Amino acid sequence: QAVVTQESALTTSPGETVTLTCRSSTGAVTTSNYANWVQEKPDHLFTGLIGGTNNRAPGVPARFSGSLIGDKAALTITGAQTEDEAIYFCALWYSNHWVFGGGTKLTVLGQPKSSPSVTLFPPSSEELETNKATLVCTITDFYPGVVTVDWKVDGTPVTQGMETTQPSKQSNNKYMASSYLTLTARAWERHSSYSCQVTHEGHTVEKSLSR
Amino acid sequence: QVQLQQPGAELVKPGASVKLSCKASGYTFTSYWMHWVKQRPGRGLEWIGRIDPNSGGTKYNEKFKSKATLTVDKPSSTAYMQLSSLTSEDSAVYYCARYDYYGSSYFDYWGQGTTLTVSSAKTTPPSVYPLAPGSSMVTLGCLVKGYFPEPVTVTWNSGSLSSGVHTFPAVLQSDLYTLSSSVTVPSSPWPSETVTCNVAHPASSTKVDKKIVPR
Questions:
Q1: Which residues of B touch A48 (CB under 8 A)?
Q2: Separation in Å, CA B210 to CA A31, A34, B144, B194, B196
Q3: Which of A96, A178, B6, B22 satisfies CB 3.0 to 4.6 Å to B168 for a cystine?
């Protein structure tokens, strides 16, 4: 019955100082909220960084410090490193339970930004023979690894039917993800313009098919 | 050498229950509280509740009050969590985390999470469908749809093609997984030179080859 809010994504460069914040929907964050900061590296790898607002877990580099800034809990990375690229979650205590924030995806540029490579495929015909149609939108080689994928059937933002995977790290250290829009053989034949729009580090890429 | 061990995955049928374990070693079980967290990939973490290993006393998230039950076996140093009346929607990663309660108030050590998959399906082989474009380098791909269980292996030209191959993570879509794979081939190979995707699925012992032809 409280909502912790965190920045969605933050991008920095090795050597910089970056601050992540944790806001509580009920009021200012205070020391009795015992702000905790947790880091998630790929592979479902969790480690605790800070607890009780400013206590650094043992074996967590000193570049990490927590504090209260204004009415919120903050985590500062002083001299961010390439290794710090991960998802940081804050947790706040509320007298009887814990509420976790949505997490902040932090990117520490370890190579130049790279735009996504988007491709939209039409439902194959063997599949239209099943009374089904699935438009696949593939997005690869993007960095920072955060995107927004929006589908638009006939000019209208589809809002149900789509599924977008979570960015997965490729070998070169760039990311990939694909989004699926499943229609029926029939929904397929009805509408006429499909489009997969991918938003990445401010530029947009729209790939449209025409039935 | 602090460690929280959790089994990696668990498959259960809908309507049943599961007892997830979390074996602790390298520290005194007792000086620390044990918390359980739910991670729906694509959503945050949700706190489930905690247990004090000394008294066995628990505190739950009201939301889970009726879905989870925390338990402890002091002697074997293990925390357990039962989840009842499971449904597709309970599928997710459940982690156990230690909390330095008498000390600095952090969730220092975490278990690797158990991926719970709740599904009524039976070994089901994939249906590979070819993805050719519509209109220098061209991207081809394969849709491996409605298979179960996980995993499947995708290969292009039986392995000859290993550069520019991207194989995406599967998504659980109605008790069944779907995954697709793509390869970027110069515009000269294709469609001059055949591109064929190969899908292998152990559980069901399938192997399907599908040639990507224009359409």
A1: 97, 106-110
A2: 61, 56, 11, 10, 5
A3: A178
A96 and A191 within one domain: no
Count how many pairs of residues, chain A against chain B, have C-beta atoms within 8 Å.
Answer: 132
Q: Which two tokens stand for residue B172?
A: 């659980």
A51 touches chain B (CB under 8 A): yes
Q: Which CATH number fits domain B121-214: 2.60.40.10, 3.40.50.2300, 1.10.645.10, 2.40.10.10?
A: 2.60.40.10
CA distance B91 to chain A (A): 15
Number of C-beta neighbours around residue A85 at 10 A: 22
A11/A101 same-domain check: yes
Contact criterion met (CB < 8 Å) for B215 and A98? no
How many Å lie between the alpha carbon of B76 and the closest alpha carbon of chain A?
A: 24
Q: Which domain holds residue A25?
A: 1-110
Residues paired with A149 in a beta bridge: A198
CATH superfamily of domain region B1-120? Immunoglobulins (2.60.40.10)
Q: Indicate if A25 and A87 belong to the same structural domain.
A: yes
Expt. technique: X-ray
Chain A residue numbers touching B110 (CB-CB < 8 A): 38, 46-48
- Number of neighbouring beta carbons within 10 Å of residue B123: 13
- Enumerate the residues of chain B whose CB falls inside 8 A of the CB of residue A126: 129-130
Q: Which helix (H) or strand (E) holds A127?
A: helix A125-128
Verify cis geometry, omega within 30 degrees of 0, for the bond prior to B149: yes
Q: Which residues on chain B are in Cβ contact (under 8 Å) with A97? A: 47, 49, 59-62
